[PDB]
Amino acid sequence: XXXXXXXXXXXXXXXXXXXXXXXXXXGYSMFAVGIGALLFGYWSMMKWNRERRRLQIEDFEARIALMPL
Amino acid sequence: ELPSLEDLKVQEVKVSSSVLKAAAHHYGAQCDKPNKEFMLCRWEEKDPRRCL
């Protein structure tokens, strides 16, 4: 009996298949989150600066109140 | 120059340490009449020798 190297292909490994595809981001939907984070960013920040004004006037009031200084 | 007397004004000046005075802003509301009259005197007459 002769024994040589046997042939096997099975699945053929798929000859040239695309793996690159669009994922997560679509296009217009990313701008809704992108610019949406900006509008949420300013509104949250400016409310803190209005709360800073409560401290600001109260800080300068200490100088006016102190005349024996 | 003609300076003020060695006895000067106010016996035992200041209460204690700083920040303590800055902690209370109620000093503006209570006792304002002596503070405002000293302020009114000093801006009209710049000399400390007169409004002491």
The Cα–Cα gap between B39 and B36 comes to 5
CA–CA–CA angle A6, A8, A9 (5° rounding) = 160
- Please give, rounded to a whole number of angstroms, the shortest distance from the CA of B5 to a CA of chain A: 20
* Dihedral (CA of B8, B41, B45, A66) sign: positive
Radius of gyration from C-alpha coordinates of chain B? 14
The b-or-e profile of A17-43 (16+ CB within 10 A means b, else e) is eeeeeeeeeeeeeeeeeeeeeeeeeee
CA separation, residue B38 to residues A63, B6, B33 (Å): 15, 21, 9
**What does DSSP assign to residue A6?**
P
* DSSP SS3 for A14: coil
Identify the three-state secondary structure at position B39: helix
Q: In chain B, which among 13-52 make CB contacts under 8 A with chain A?
A: 14, 21-22, 25, 27-28, 35, 38-39
Kindly report the nearest CA distance between residue A47 and chain B, in angstroms.
25
Q: Smallest Cα–Cα separation from B35: which of A62, A57, A66, A61?
A: A66
Distance CA B21, CA B29 (A): 14
Contacts of A69 in chain B (CB under 8 A): 21
Report the alpha-carbon distance of residue B24 to residue A33 in Å, rounded.
47
- Three-state secondary structure along A15-61? CCCCCCCCCCCCCHHHHHHHHHHHHHHHHHHHHHHHHHHHHHHHHHH
Rounded Cα gap, residues A56 and B7, in angstroms:
40
Q: Are B14 and A68 a contacting pair at CB < 8 A?
A: yes
Q: What is the resolution of this structure in A?
A: 4.3
